[PDB]
């Protein structure tokens with residue numbers, strides 16, 4: 001890698017690892033469209049297995065960017081419209097509170113207060129229907145944003161129904177395979193478990209537990225190389241030869257709602273570039289990121305703005321991830337760690353690196 005990249009990465013990430021006690025970490029810096037890879041530490045502490053460029057990490061909520069793009073691909077196929085009522089795809093959702101709640105609302109967390117998590121007691125299709133049937137909104141749809149797995153998770157599950165494919169099959173055939181993300185998985189096959197890092201929470205090795213709508217909201221595992229290719233694909237959608245996927249990537253970076261200086265895409269979140277670093281750092285703290293905030297609609301949605309900071313944080317019990325990129329600058333970063341450490345530390349480090357290389 002260019003000396004300037006090696007230098008800023010050492011000076012930023014090695015102290016981050018020291019400060020946060022991260023057992024293993026992989027970073028990709030995309031500079032002038034090309035990825036440069038860095039690894040530290042161990043995927044499995046007890047077995048002394050180092051992190052490599054083939055190590056699989058849990059992406060947590062970065063998975064939502066895949067869901068958003070898969071939804072965009074379905075829009076480009078004409079299979080769904082974001083204005084469609086939720087009940088068009090789940091007619092059994094007869095409760096009156098669902099009148100007026102569209103796929104747009106589900107995808108952008110604006111349905112009216114769907115909860116952060118699907119309750120852990122939901123373990124069957126009947127349980128899932130009862131959960132959504134009995135949920136009572138706190139606000140009218142399209143007025144407040146409340147980040148929620150139960151919202152975009154349902155969007156993903158319904159967006160694939162016209163295709164007749166399961167969510168996993170749709171994701172594999174329509175996103176992973178065309179982009180050659182051949183070491184990206186919703187379910188890690190046995191032959192690949194040898195590459196699956198352990199997450200660490202309070203010193204204990206852990207993997208994410210199964211849960212309702214997990215694939216849609218937080219269940220993807222990937223390598224640093226596949227995640228760099230994911231960033232490249234979102235940086236340069238015109239390089240994607242499948243037209244519906246090219247357009248789906250673009251639609252996930254459209255701006256559908258605004259709150260403060262932040263814009264909501266499909267999975268992705270965006271700010272205008274140049275960005276105020278304190279806003280993205282402070283706004284990444286879960287005290288803000290998970291709070292209800294009023295939103296203003298953007299009608300029609302702003303087509304993807306190249307001068308944007310596009311990003312997403314993600315976590316599981318044992319992992320912490322961050323992706324950010326700037327299309328106009330062909331510049332991005334992926335940070336994958338097997339400890340869930342605070343979001344503002346992730347965003348600060350990412351800013352320091354990309355700011356140094358702009």
Ligand SMILES: [Cl-]
Pocket residue numbers: 010011
């Ligand atoms: Cl140093």
Ligand SMILES: [Zn+2]
Pocket residue numbers: 010011014
């Ligand atoms: Zn040093």
Ligand SMILES: [Zn+2]
Pocket residue numbers: 183
């Ligand atoms: Zn392989």
